[model samples]
Target chain A: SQIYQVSTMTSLLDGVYDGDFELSEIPKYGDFGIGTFNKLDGELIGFDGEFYRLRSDGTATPVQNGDRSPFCSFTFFTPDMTHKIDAKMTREDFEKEINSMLPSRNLFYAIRIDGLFKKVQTRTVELQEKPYVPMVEAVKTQPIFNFDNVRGTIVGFLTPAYANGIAVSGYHLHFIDEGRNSGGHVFDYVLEDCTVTISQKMNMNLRLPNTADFFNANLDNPDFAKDIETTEGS
Target chain B: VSQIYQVSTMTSLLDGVYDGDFELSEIPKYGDFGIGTFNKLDGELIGFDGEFYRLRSDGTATPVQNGDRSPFCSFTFFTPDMTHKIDAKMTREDFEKEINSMLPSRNLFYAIRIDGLFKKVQTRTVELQEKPYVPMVEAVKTQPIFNFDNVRGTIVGFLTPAYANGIAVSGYHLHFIDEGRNSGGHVFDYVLEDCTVTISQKMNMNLRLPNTADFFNANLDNPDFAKDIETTEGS
Candidate 1:
């Protein structure tokens, strides 16, 4: 089963970046998922039952449970299926390969891919301050990273179309290394040898926050549809 | 919150899709259990545990055939996620309010099942309406209500997402059948003595519409769904 989500993708797509939930509650409800901090602090990764902040300074920091988040989604990870692959492919090819392996597009799936990569490219945004700049603006200044022959794991979910406006419609993932030493919001990666675990989430509980900012924002902003593709079309 | 599968359209039912052209054969593929009406209100159809039956205006049920036709129906494979007890006495309105709050979101669909005994209740089914079929609003006027006391039975219900107005019954729509399988119909009102409630969330949907001429000619854009379907059952 899946857990509740506090915010909406429409809000993020509309650039109304604000935190109405305590980040401490994320893992208290789910063991694995992905999210961003209140001020676009960095890439958020929930792996192996914990949370980490992968920053652009080339460092992965353990986030205290008492923090806050602008947007995030997580769930306890008990996989329903596991697969081992010694295949090699680009990021796009890898996605196509994964889709062929999925059973249905109607259900939700928590996915974790662990392996050694031949090459990996990622991006981590700089932290924001002041009246809290929106995520789109924050991402504009994001720094890129390129690694060669590294070992790491990818954590995220495959959400359904019914949740397109409420949650990420397709694959939404974040990456972190084995030792929590490196990694960020994955842009590209070449897999060499990997093991994939997929967990089927039969039900989902969505929690809508009632904050002033959230209440005032227009979730149906027509521009949101196009912005979703621009922000994370992959 | 849930997934769903529906037959025909509620607007068409209001605009007059009373002719049951879609055979009972289609229902079996949609779900193991659910509820609907026969051609031109011939009878109220109830499908439970893979068995389908028809309830006439006299409040009697008989096994129906695969050749039997229906214009409107909704069902699922009947898989519940959790169960709860309803021991407290309450009106149907209050009971609905309770479940509405318990629903995790207004975005998804929910399947509800309540079983046990009803201290008091009222249910209704219709007789067949032949040539020149009457619309649902007028047809429900001729339906008869059957009252019961201290009866044991199961309730089949669906909580369609608010957005699916024309496609499905918005909010909660339920059907009833007693333990003896003697009394059944579209539920009007009831008092639960003590019952067990089972709920499930659907993740996807499959919709089938009639390919008949009447279905294509009927208007489906009537936005007065909340007001129109209200009288579709005369509850």
Candidate 2:
């Protein structure tokens, strides 16, 4: 069997400390002049109107206008490329790890999830029938349960029955064009078999009306949901 | 030729000077829309911002602002349009003819507009010269012999010397008394005079020098005939 080898080449272009041309030298060219140089990070940076070229020493002779040039850098990539980056984590762990790539100053960060990504639908159950009493009063009369017990058992099974859950159950996609050319072109891709795991746990504690008379005994502070009077009787 | 009159009295200062017959034609009635005559005087020249009123022979003076006035005739020029409340209406030519006919002489008295209407006249020009420093000597009291020290002396009282000899001899004089009883008992008196005698005697005694020694010697030890001796000897 013959083995096919693929290789990739990358180049770094920093206008700050790599290019041979200085900002002051731009005036010699008819198309290029002093205005073509931009000062970035205290270095002379010259642009051929499009691509920027950086001076090596990061310093250029001051122009007649007495302004210092900019400093910058750039890198390039060439075919044929098959880059393998080691990411030994699950999708959730991968997402967390990617989010951790923050600037040293910790000022701001951005996340862009590109490429054939899709959302997964999870199951939930909701109450379809109204109870014998007001839902809030019914809850108050029932035995209080902790959040861990309620979230893991009751709410966990009840949320997946809603209409929204039924609508978001499954999805299908198809791509019409693929962009794989030197010049700018449109590309598309399809996604299938998308799944997500959600293991959120919620726990709460509630007080009963009597038994220990928790309300009057320990102040009228009960965690049971109640209807609050937001407006006065008209 | 203009005749010079040295009249001393204020009234009748210009009486009988000219043969012109003074006529009052309703005071040269200026119409309700023109510059009215304000003042007139023959000898006085109108100064800047100085106004004059025509002291009418009937003893009435018309008020004018920012214009010249004379005794014989008064006229005002109106750079700005002004209205005069004349009791009667008359043309400029008619007014001029009336004034010419009423005046005693045409050459001697006539109203002419020299400058702006109703503009005040400038004051008389006075050029002042620098005056010489005159020492003011005040006499302390009356005495036969003036002892400047015995009586409070002051350098007051002297006029600008006119003659060359007077200027050369001008100085302070100190008189002395030597009567037996009056010498020591009588109170000394001093008089500050600018007479020629005192100035000549002071010059002879060298009292006018830039030193007080000459004055002290002449006043204390010089004989009674010292002034005469010094004047004859040219000391």
Q: lDDT of each prediction vs. the true structure?
A: 0.73, 0.18
Q: Write the per-residue lDDT of candidate 2 for residues B178-209, one digit (tens) a residue.
A: 11111211111222121111100000000011
The ten-residue window of minimal lDDT in model 1 chain B covers: B203-212
The candidate that achieves the highest lDDT relative to the unseen native structure:
1
Give TM-scores for every candidate, taking all chains together and pairing residue i with residue i: 0.55, 0.11
Positional deviation of residue B4's Cα in model 2 after best superposition, in angstroms: 99
Residue B157 in model 1: shift from native, Å?
14
Runs of candidate 1 with Cα error greater than 4 angstroms are: A130-134, B1-235
Q: lDDT tens digits, residues B141-195, model 1?
A: 8688888888899878788764355556777788888888777888888888889
